[PDB]
Design an enzyme around this catalytic site. Structure first.
Site, short mmCIF file in Angstrom:
data_model
loop_
_atom_site.label_atom_id
_atom_site.label_comp_id
_atom_site.label_asym_id
_atom_site.label_seq_id
_atom_site.Cartn_x
_atom_site.Cartn_y
_atom_site.Cartn_z
N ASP A 125 0.83 -1.21 0.00
CA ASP A 125 0.00 0.00 0.00
C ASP A 125 0.86 1.26 0.00
O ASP A 125 0.47 2.28 -0.58
CB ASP A 125 -0.94 0.04 1.21
CG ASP A 125 -2.30 -0.63 0.95
OD1 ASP A 125 -2.55 -1.13 -0.17
OD2 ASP A 125 -3.15 -0.64 1.89
N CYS A 150 -1.69 0.01 -14.15
CA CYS A 150 -1.88 0.18 -12.72
C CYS A 150 -3.00 1.21 -12.58
O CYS A 150 -4.01 1.09 -13.27
CB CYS A 150 -0.57 0.58 -12.02
SG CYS A 150 0.49 1.77 -12.94
N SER A 151 -2.87 2.22 -11.71
CA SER A 151 -3.92 3.24 -11.74
C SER A 151 -3.69 4.27 -12.84
O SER A 151 -4.58 4.50 -13.67
CB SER A 151 -4.06 3.94 -10.39
OG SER A 151 -5.35 4.55 -10.33
N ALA A 152 -2.51 4.89 -12.90
CA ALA A 152 -2.25 5.86 -13.97
C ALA A 152 -1.49 5.26 -15.15
O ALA A 152 -1.41 5.89 -16.20
CB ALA A 152 -1.47 7.07 -13.43
N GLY A 153 -0.96 4.05 -15.02
CA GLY A 153 -0.26 3.46 -16.13
C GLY A 153 1.14 3.99 -16.34
O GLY A 153 1.64 3.96 -17.46
N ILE A 154 1.80 4.50 -15.29
CA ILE A 154 3.16 5.00 -15.48
C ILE A 154 4.12 4.60 -14.36
O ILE A 154 5.33 4.52 -14.59
CB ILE A 154 3.15 6.55 -15.61
CG1 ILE A 154 2.57 7.19 -14.33
CG2 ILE A 154 2.39 6.98 -16.90
CD1 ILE A 154 2.72 8.72 -14.30
N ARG A 202 3.95 1.86 -11.28
CA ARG A 202 4.16 0.41 -11.24
C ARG A 202 4.29 -0.17 -12.64
O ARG A 202 5.13 -1.05 -12.88
CB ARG A 202 3.01 -0.27 -10.49
CG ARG A 202 2.87 0.24 -9.04
CD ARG A 202 1.67 -0.38 -8.35
NE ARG A 202 1.46 0.20 -7.03
CZ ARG A 202 0.49 -0.17 -6.20
NH1 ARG A 202 -0.34 -1.15 -6.55
NH2 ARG A 202 0.37 0.42 -5.02
N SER A 203 3.44 0.28 -13.57
CA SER A 203 3.56 -0.17 -14.96
C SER A 203 4.95 0.11 -15.51
O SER A 203 5.53 -0.72 -16.23
CB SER A 203 2.50 0.53 -15.82
OG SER A 203 1.21 0.09 -15.43
N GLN A 213 7.33 6.93 -10.96
CA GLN A 213 6.78 8.13 -10.34
C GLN A 213 7.52 8.60 -9.09
O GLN A 213 7.22 9.69 -8.60
CB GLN A 213 5.30 7.89 -9.96
CG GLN A 213 4.38 7.83 -11.16
CD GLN A 213 2.92 7.54 -10.76
OE1 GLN A 213 2.59 6.43 -10.37
NE2 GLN A 213 2.06 8.54 -10.86
#
Ligand SMILES: [Cl-]
Ligand SMILES: [Cl-]
Ligand SMILES: [Cl-]
Ligand SMILES: [Cl-]
Ligand SMILES: [Cl-]
Ligand SMILES: [Cl-]
Ligand SMILES: [Cl-]
Ligand SMILES: [Cl-]
Length: 281
Positions: free
Chosen positions: A181, A215-219, A221-222, A262
């Site tokens: 988290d 992931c959430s924004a795609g930048i 974790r992705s 990020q």
């Protein structure tokens, strides 16, 4: 390798924040005009995270072609990825349309649908076999066929049917469910095990369309997932595996989608995963 020496150096000198900010400063800047059109306001999860025009995925059907998704084509590593945000309640049909049209075989999900009590992604796939999903806008049907729930990830077999042609395709859904988290994992072991499961599946093979990663924004974790995979390919493939420079690979990736990685912790975690992954291979 030598990489692990540079890693301990960066840790001793405490300069992860400085390296990361240099990456942000050297990163490519390309237009995102389409993403910022007024009619695409409700197709973007985060107004601060947009695909570049040159690398954006275009939907084929007769409607707005826009989805927040980017083709990352790594020439030297010979691998392509589609990085996209976690779909929204009104873009799940677009998301599966993209999977269909781009001929992807796997979808890689790196977040839980809700983390720290906040939604990161719509429930864009069926949780129960008998309750399939129909996306009426893009004319697609999606059925859960089976799912293998493991301790650190779940793999689902999904059946995607183009209701227009009645053609069907088996899509593999790789859901990494145990990213912390807060921050990053102390160890990259389970992330690396997850990567190798995706590789073993065949989903990254060039006979298929590019894997879709989100992931959430795609930048963030992705970006970690794709950065580590590409660096590990380069280390196994290059005549001199020590010549792989993670920061250079990340800048190359950022020519295709803004903001990959990020945080300085995510950068450090990426170095750690490549180091540990290279030992394994
Ligand atoms: Cl518009
Ligand atoms: Cl490359
Ligand atoms: Cl979830
Ligand atoms: Cl397990
Ligand atoms: Cl591979
Ligand atoms: Cl995320
Ligand atoms: Cl390099
Ligand atoms: Cl950034």
């Amino acid at each position: 390798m030598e990489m692990e020496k540079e890693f301990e150096q960066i840790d001793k000198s405490g300069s992860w924040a400085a390296i990361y900010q240099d990456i942000r400063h050297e990163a490519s800047d390309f237009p995102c005009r389409v993403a910022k059109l007024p009619k695409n306001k409700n197709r973007n999860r985060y107004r601060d995270v947009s695909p570049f025009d040159h690398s954006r995925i275009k939907l084929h059907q007769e409607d707005n072609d826009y989805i927040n998704a980017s083709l990352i084509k790594m020439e030297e590593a010979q691998r392509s990825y589609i990085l996209t945000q976690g779909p929204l309640p009104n873009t799940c049909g677009h998301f599966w349309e993209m999977v269909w049209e781009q001929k992807s075989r796997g979808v890689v999900m790196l977040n839980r649908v809700m983390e720290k009590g906040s939604l990161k992604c719509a429930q864009y796939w069926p949780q129960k076999e008998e309750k399939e999903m129909i996306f009426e806008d893009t004319n697609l049907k999606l059925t859960l066929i089976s799912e293998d729930i493991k301790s650190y990830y779940t793999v689902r077999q999904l059946e995607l049917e183009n209701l227009t042609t009645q053609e069907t395709r088996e899509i593999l859904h790789f859901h990494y469910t145990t990213w912390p988290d807060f921050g990053v994992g102390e160890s990259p072991a389970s992330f690396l095990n997850f990567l190798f499961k995706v590789r073993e599946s065949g989903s990254l093979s060039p006979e298929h369309g590019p894997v879709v990663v989100h992931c959430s924004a795609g930048i963030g974790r992705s970006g970690t997932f794709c950065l580590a995979d590409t660096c590990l390919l380069l280390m196994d493939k290059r005549k001199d595996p020590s010549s792989v420079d993670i920061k250079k690979v990340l800048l190359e990736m950022r020519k295709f989608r803004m903001g990959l990685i990020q945080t300085a912790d995510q950068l450090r975690f990426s170095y750690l995963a490549v180091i540990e992954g290279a030992k394994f291979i």
